[model samples]
Target: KKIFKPEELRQALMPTLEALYRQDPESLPFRQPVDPQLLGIPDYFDIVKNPMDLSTIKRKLDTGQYQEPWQYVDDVWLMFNNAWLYNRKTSRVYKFCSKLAEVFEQEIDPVMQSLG
Candidate 1:
């Protein structure tokens, strides 16, 4: 999903994040952690106020610019990884990344899977 505005992405994702925040994942009635590694991220996340400019991330990722395309994607991963590395105090649910991990698994991972 291409987020046109900074808050636009937040608007789409925050409700689901808050909803997930309330439920206990290990015992949640619906989907739990799709990927375990996403749960284990450290507590100290370098939150950037102006990452508001996702176009910078987009530019780094545009095709025909890098010798290793995967590294370009890695930059995005790092961008978002520390971009909001919410601390998973105990479970994956606590991690900010977990809020959207399902999004990756369902929306993004399958695309990668087919290519692989």
Candidate 2:
């Protein structure tokens, strides 16, 4: 049976992360972990049970923490979902989240299809 190794999965996911990072000029907001103190949203940590960001995913991938393709993809989706839950539809962050979701699907779909 065709299967994936950890490094192979990491290779598949790294480009998707890089593309998402460079997809938009305003991607900085999602690039790093959220700082509740700096952003003044102290309750952000309390609300976001599994906080995630692009850099964190990179760190995990670099250290070989991702065991499968789905784990990496889940973190990417969580990063956007976190923003959607925290920001209102009228907020700029919400719009960015929507854009990233589209880019993510565009980037990940082919990779996932190739795996099967």
Candidate 3:
């Protein structure tokens, strides 16, 4: 089936981000850009090839950069994978990312599927 129109997919982006953000209300690590300098992890950029976060996704959505629903979905999953790659399995950030992975499955995927 045809996946989605850009307009409809754009409209759905914020709510999807909000749902994911809500999954980590205490400290929203995935809400903004990952500053390796701030974290003192200089090799972060080298490790995470395409770093993504909710804010960047929002900016893309606002600016009409997302050409299809899967683009937005891909960015969201990219954010998760970046965390998984950069943080150890026992780290808190990794655990939070895992939580949102579940949240994405339960809340976001169904919505995206509906957008098709």
Give a tens-digit lDDT track for model 1, residues 5-115.
Answer: 434333333343344335444214123322224744333333332221124434433433323424434543543454344433564434544444444335434433432
Q: Which 10 residues in a row give candidate 1 its minimum summed lDDT?
A: 26-35
User: Candidates ranked by lDDT, best first?
Assistant: 2, 3, 1
**Top candidate when judged by lDDT against the true structure:** 2
Error of 1 at 6 (Å): 26
Error of 3 at 11 (Å): 2.1
The all-Cα superposition gives candidate 1 an RMSD in Å to the true structure of: 12.0
lDDT of 2 by residue, 10-109 (tens): 7788888888899776577898899999988899978898999989999999988877788788888899889999889999888988998999899999
Which residue segments of model 3 deviate by more than 4 Å?
A: 1-5
Better of 1 and 3 by lDDT: 3
Candidate 1 achieves a global lDDT of 0.37
Candidate number of the best TM-score: 2
RMSD of 2: 1.5
lDDT of 3 at 61: 85
- Enumerate clash totals for all models, in the order shown: 0, 0, 0
Q: What's each prediction's TM-score?
A: 0.35, 0.91, 0.86
